[PDB]
Amino acid sequence: INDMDYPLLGSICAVCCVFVAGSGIWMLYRLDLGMGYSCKPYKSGRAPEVNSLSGIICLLCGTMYAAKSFDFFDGGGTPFSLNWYWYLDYVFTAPLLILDFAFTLDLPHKIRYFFAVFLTLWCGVAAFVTPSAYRFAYYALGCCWFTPFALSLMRHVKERYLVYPPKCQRWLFWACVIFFGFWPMFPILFIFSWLGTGHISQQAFYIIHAFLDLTCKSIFGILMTVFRLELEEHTEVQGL
Amino acid sequence: INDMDYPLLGSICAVCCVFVAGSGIWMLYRLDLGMGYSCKPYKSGRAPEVNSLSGIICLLCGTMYAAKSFDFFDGGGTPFSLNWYWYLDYVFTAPLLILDFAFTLDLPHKIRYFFAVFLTLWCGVAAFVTPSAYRFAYYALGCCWFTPFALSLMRHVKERYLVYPPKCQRWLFWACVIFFGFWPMFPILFIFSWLGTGHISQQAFYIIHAFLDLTCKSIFGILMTVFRLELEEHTEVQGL
Amino acid sequence: INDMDYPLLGSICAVCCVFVAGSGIWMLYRLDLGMGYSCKPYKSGRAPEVNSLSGIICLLCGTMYAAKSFDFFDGGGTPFSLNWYWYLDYVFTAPLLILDFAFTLDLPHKIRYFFAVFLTLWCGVAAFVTPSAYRFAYYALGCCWFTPFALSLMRHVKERYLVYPPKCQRWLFWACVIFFGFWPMFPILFIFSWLGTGHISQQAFYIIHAFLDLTCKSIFGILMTVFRLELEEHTEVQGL
Numbered sequence A, B, C: 001i002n003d004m005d006y007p008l009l010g011s012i013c014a015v016c017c018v019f020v021a022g023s024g025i026w027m028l029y030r031l032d033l034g035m036g037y038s039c040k041p042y043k044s045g046r047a048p049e050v051n052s053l054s055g056i057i058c059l060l061c062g063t064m065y066a067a068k069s070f071d072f073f074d075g076g077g078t079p080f081s082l083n084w085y086w087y088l089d090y091v092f093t094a095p096l097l098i099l100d101f102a103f104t105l106d107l108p109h110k111i112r113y114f115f116a117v118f119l120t121l122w123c124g125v126a127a128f129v130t131p132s133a134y135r136f137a138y139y140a141l142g143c144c145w146f147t148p149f150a151l152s153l154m155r156h157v158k159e160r161y162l163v164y165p166p167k168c169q170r171w172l173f174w175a176c177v178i179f180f181g182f183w184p185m186f187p188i189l190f191i192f193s194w195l196g197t198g199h200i201s202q203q204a205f206y207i208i209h210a211f212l213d214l215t216c217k218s219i220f221g222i223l224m225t226v227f228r229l230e231l232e233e234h235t236e237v238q239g240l
């Protein structure tokens, strides 16, 4: 029985659509202005393609929630629902975030991080659709993909959290707080959801992910964008 | 009721399969011969990977119509139909065209153009499968993705439509005629199709897209290929 | 009627999961140690991203068989089966192998090889799901994609099978034996399977592919990894 306040879920996703996509539009707006706060012709004249992943993820997530709002506003499972099959939305955005983060600090093993998160989500997608005792087997299969990735990412972050000046170090620090504080929240919610323990009802499950995706895309993307501006101001505007 | 001349639709797709794929085979045939009309060892000996997207798109589209012909020749919706779920075919080819066009003139924002068309098609794919009033909401969601992309592409084309010599400028001009004259034809057909207004029956809907895809893949790809030959003849064969 | 020894098929896939993924873990283990057998700081300190495709394919295939084991252990077609729709698993791994092989020897036409195998598998995926006389039409469509690719790959291999020293030439030779001896085995099995002639029952069909995927991913990947070590030892450790 999925009797729940669908217009409320549609309203939240509509609000999340405006904020995440609106931040994405601003995110691309500030990219093609200069190296940082000061406007510069950006050498050739075009920003690097690796510096525009943060904005597109929000727009990709912004239109993702718009489609979910249409599913929720209708009052059931639309053919193009994006909500009936869980976590299929994050299969495309989440591997872009770590790749976007990898290019920001020039982290190594960018391809490994992409497939670690791509396969973590797909294992999770398999968990929701399987209504058997092997749903936790896929979850266990997902967790043994995410855990080595999370611990390997944290290490390479600590190495790079040593040369950046304190001006841009705070922006990197808050990005990691969103990273390691809210990415592990998705597996935790699955355990306690109606699929696992049962503490969290399905209606409240959508709402938490709506706020998590604000944090993981828009707010994390804003932190990355401001971090790039401070980084390029200190290096390519100050020479140091 | 989908009572329509399926063998006619299969015959058209079979004919479209031969022409588009046949052009693609020629497209890759002329690439590995030299810089342009005159044969040159191409420096290293291999053509750049970015210069072979035009041919593969036609082969990808050529085999795409072969699968549609099998669906039409059977006389219904085959399990691997490629026609029951509309525009799922263009989700992979259309984002390759703008990326192929972007690499040809070295347009900036190549990643943004890819996702603008990738998400334009997916929003359109969502429109066909949803049999509710939100089908036009997905169409409105698709149009607000395509329109900024179309206007931003046109601008960066005008900037590059200033340095090319008139010999290769005509090839670029006709590519843009196919670009901005026939890409906007796909959204227009959706409004007037049986899903929207109802002017165009479903049987005639396949036929128009069969000719549009000839123009958008094979004919547009031929224009791009000839444009590259003239471009490289003037630059890397003449020194100017 | 699919009455077959499902726990046996689950056990084989579980065993294949451990070996392929275990080899993949070792494959990435030996990459970040040095150029070859001798440990070297690898210039910058990080291995090239193109040198880590072999390990990830095995991990991608290792987790692929784990999901199949869950489907087989359950005793039927799970919602996330990976076995009900055939060859959908290889759509992602097989195009990575030829791309991984292309980067190893710096083969040209890397993009063409990727789409040749990507479209060969998709045409094959269409063959299994279509229960009509056009299943062999998709197979014929797949074979006319694979055959030009197989013959073009063989040629460019012969050109590169001339400069490598005999120390690493044996590793390349055995990689080609796995390449041209076992990749053509997949189309051959389809003809003689229960879909085609009928010699091979469905129960025995999974088992052969389980051993083929060991050879095509783990054993082929091991051959590629050892080949890289000998190649880099002779070039970047010996100077020759």
Ligand SMILES: CCCCCCCC/C=C/CCCCCCCC(=O)OC[C@H](COP(=O)(O)OCCN)OC(=O)CCCCCCC/C=C/CCCCCCCC
Pocket (backbone or CB within 6 Å): A063, A064, A067, A076, A077, A078, A079, A080, A081, A082, A084, A085, A088, A089, B085, B088, B119, B122, B123, B125, B126, B129
């Ligand atoms: C919009 C921008 C998106 C950008 C990125 C998109 C990529 C993500 C792809 C999303 C795939 C979406 C699949 C969603 C399937 C949802 C199926 C579903 O909702 O089933 C439930 C529902 C039952 O609900 P009720 O009938 O109301 O029951 C109550 C009794 N009155 O069943 C149905 O409605 C029937 C579903 C019709 C067929 C579904 C067609 C799905 C759309 C196909 C396009 C996606 C192509 C995917 C490629 C693989 C090819 C299958």
Ligand SMILES: CCCCCCCC/C=C/CCCCCCCC(=O)OC[C@H](COP(=O)(O)OCCN)OC(=O)CCCCCCC/C=C/CCCCCCCC
Pocket (backbone or CB within 6 Å): B063, B064, B067, B076, B077, B078, B079, B080, B081, B082, B084, B085, B088, B089, C085, C088, C119, C122, C123, C125, C126, C129
């Ligand atoms: C060939 C080269 C292709 C290269 C690139 C390919 C990428 C594009 C992927 C295309 C996905 C194709 C999905 C097509 C689904 C079509 C479903 C369909 O036709 O339903 C209609 C039809 C009803 O018609 P009738 O029975 O005749 O009614 C009349 C009464 N006698 O329903 C059916 O036939 C049942 C369909 C069987 C299941 C469909 C299986 C689809 C094939 C799955 C492979 C695709 C994998 C996609 C990945 C996501 C996993 C789902």
Ligand SMILES: CCCCCCCC/C=C/CCCCCCCC(=O)OC[C@H](COP(=O)(O)OCCN)OC(=O)CCCCCCC/C=C/CCCCCCCC
Pocket (backbone or CB within 6 Å): A085, A088, A119, A122, A123, A125, A126, A129, C063, C064, C067, C076, C077, C078, C079, C080, C081, C082, C084, C085, C088, C089
């Ligand atoms: C785990 C790591 C994976 C990493 C890479 C993954 C990428 C590959 C994607 C794999 C797609 C998997 C699709 C598998 C569909 C299988 C459908 C199936 O099994 O049907 C058979 C089965 C009939 O069997 P029985 O009922 O037992 O009959 C006996 C009588 N008692 O039918 C069912 O069980 C109903 C199926 C429920 C719906 C299936 C939902 C599939 C999961 C969707 C997630 C995949 C998203 C794909 C994107 C396109 C959107 C559709």
Ligand SMILES: CCCCCCCC/C=C\CCCCCCCC(=O)OC[C@H](COP(=O)(O)OCCN)OC(=O)CCCCCCC/C=C/CCCCCCCC
Pocket (backbone or CB within 6 Å): A099, A110, A111, A114, C048, C049, C050, C091, C092, C093, C095, C096, C118
């Ligand atoms: C619907 C089914 C679709 C499934 C199709 C699967 C096809 C797989 C798609 C491509 C696989 C990814 C391989 C891409 C090649 C990797 C890029 C490359 O060659 O290296 C370029 C270069 C290498 O570094 P160097 O130049 O040596 O730096 C020296 C230091 N100054 O790039 C880099 O710097 C590292 C960053 C590379 C990009 C990071 C990886 C991103 C890859 C995206 C994967 C897409 C997967 C799609 C789904 C997969 C399903 C299995």
Ligand SMILES: CCCCCCCC/C=C\CCCCCCCC(=O)OC[C@H](COP(=O)(O)OCCN)OC(=O)CCCCCCC/C=C/CCCCCCCC
Pocket (backbone or CB within 6 Å): A048, A049, A050, A091, A092, A093, A095, A096, A118, B099, B110, B111, B114
């Ligand atoms: C089935 C579900 C599958 C979904 C999986 C989604 C994974 C996403 C796959 C990869 C995402 C794309 C990121 C690729 C990295 C971008 C390439 C890069 O790093 O830059 C290399 C380099 C950067 O430029 P510079 O060297 O700085 O030029 C200086 C001027 N002389 O490349 C360029 O020149 C620009 C062209 C880059 C390629 C254009 C973008 C193409 C990306 C393909 C996207 C594939 C998406 C797949 C589906 C997405 C679903 C959400």
Ligand SMILES: CCCCCCCC/C=C\CCCCCCCC(=O)OC[C@H](COP(=O)(O)OCCN)OC(=O)CCCCCCC/C=C/CCCCCCCC
Pocket (backbone or CB within 6 Å): B048, B049, B050, B091, B092, B093, B095, B096, B118, C099, C110, C111, C114
């Ligand atoms: C769910 C539906 C998803 C479908 C979305 C389809 C989007 C397509 C995704 C990207 C398409 C691939 C285009 C990638 C751009 C090609 C890379 C490029 O620009 O060149 C970089 C550079 C070019 O060579 P040079 O630098 O000139 O060497 C000089 C010699 N010293 O790279 C190379 O060296 C060659 C290797 C390039 C990578 C090989 C190709 C891999 C592409 C992966 C394709 C992914 C397809 C995804 C599914 C497709 C579905 C249709």
Ligand SMILES: CCCCCCCC/C=C\CCCCCCCC(=O)O[C@H](COC(=O)CCCCCCC/C=C/CCCCCCCC)COP(=O)(O)OCCN
Pocket (backbone or CB within 6 Å): A015, A018, A019, A022, A023, A026, A037, A219, A222, A223, A226
């Ligand atoms: C716990 C409460 C959470 C509330 C949700 C958050 C709401 C969004 C507010 C921003 C959150 C992230 C901000 C990250 C910190 C950056 C703030 C900042 O100060 O940035 C500046 C400058 O950079 C910026 O401008 C970034 C801030 C811009 C954020 C824009 C907000 C998002 C845009 C959405 C607009 C569209 C929304 C549609 C309406 C919503 C309808 C529901 C950096 O320099 P300073 O530290 O100030 O030092 C001064 C000297 N340089």
Ligand SMILES: CCCCCCCC/C=C\CCCCCCCC(=O)O[C@H](COC(=O)CCCCCCC/C=C/CCCCCCCC)COP(=O)(O)OCCN
Pocket (backbone or CB within 6 Å): B015, B018, B019, B022, B023, B026, B037, B219, B222, B223, B226
């Ligand atoms: C409104 C009527 C539309 C008719 C459909 C179009 C039919 C295809 C004909 C070509 C259309 C696109 C042509 C674009 C313009 C290029 C023509 C051209 O002249 O190219 C040359 C040279 O480049 C070329 O050769 C390109 C033309 C090659 C086109 C090959 C036709 C497509 C190949 C398909 C063969 C397989 C078809 C299978 C049979 C079909 C069965 C149904 C450029 O140099 P010139 O301007 O002539 O100046 C001379 C000094 N340099």
Ligand SMILES: CCCCCCCC/C=C\CCCCCCCC(=O)O[C@H](COC(=O)CCCCCCC/C=C/CCCCCCCC)COP(=O)(O)OCCN
Pocket (backbone or CB within 6 Å): C015, C018, C019, C022, C023, C026, C037, C219, C222, C223, C226
């Ligand atoms: C017909 C029987 C087939 C049996 C299946 C194969 C079993 C796996 C055994 C390895 C097969 C591939 C080996 C390829 C040849 C490499 C062997 C080798 O000698 O490598 C060395 C060194 O490189 C290596 O070490 C590669 C061999 C490492 C293979 C590791 C085996 C795979 C790892 C799986 C461990 C996890 C498995 C989980 C348990 C399985 C549970 C079911 C190269 O140098 P040399 O020729 O010896 O000259 C000496 C001076 N240099």
Ligand SMILES: CC(C)CCC[C@@H](C)[C@H]1CC[C@H]2[C@@H]3CC=C4C[C@@H](O)CC[C@]4(C)[C@H]3CC[C@]12C
Pocket (backbone or CB within 6 Å): A157, A158, A161, A173, A176, A177, A178, A180, A181, A182
């Ligand atoms: C309470 C929830 C929201 C967050 C839980 C995770 C927190 C505690 C984690 C994630 C981000 C983290 C940081 C990651 C990186 C570094 C750099 C290192 O050289 C010093 C510690 C340090 C600074 C971390 C300390 C604690 C940290 C804040």
Ligand SMILES: CC(C)CCC[C@@H](C)[C@H]1CC[C@H]2[C@@H]3CC=C4C[C@@H](O)CC[C@]4(C)[C@H]3CC[C@]12C
Pocket (backbone or CB within 6 Å): B157, B158, B161, B173, B176, B177, B178, B180, B181, B182
């Ligand atoms: C009638 C249908 C087929 C086509 C409709 C769109 C037409 C009118 C558009 C698309 C291609 C276009 C061109 C795009 C680029 C340029 C370069 C600019 O510096 C002068 C005008 C100019 C040359 C355009 C004029 C008109 C144009 C031909």
Ligand SMILES: CC(C)CCC[C@@H](C)[C@H]1CC[C@H]2[C@@H]3CC=C4C[C@@H](O)CC[C@]4(C)[C@H]3CC[C@]12C
Pocket (backbone or CB within 6 Å): B136, B139, B140, B143, B144, B147, B191, B196, B197
């Ligand atoms: C968002 C900006 C860029 C505008 C682009 C979206 C436009 C073109 C879309 C959104 C609203 C649309 C309408 C949605 C609903 C209908 C009812 C249908 O039976 C006839 C066409 C019709 C009337 C549409 C035609 C075009 C339309 C105006």
Ligand SMILES: CC(C)CCC[C@@H](C)[C@H]1CC[C@H]2[C@@H]3CC=C4C[C@@H](O)CC[C@]4(C)[C@H]3CC[C@]12C
Pocket (backbone or CB within 6 Å): C157, C158, C161, C173, C176, C177, C178, C180, C181, C182
């Ligand atoms: C019997 C099954 C397993 C394998 C069938 C295919 C075999 C016969 C093929 C695939 C790998 C092949 C090799 C591919 C490349 C070369 C390099 C060339 O300069 C000499 C011959 C040579 C060395 C081949 C000879 C035969 C070969 C071994």
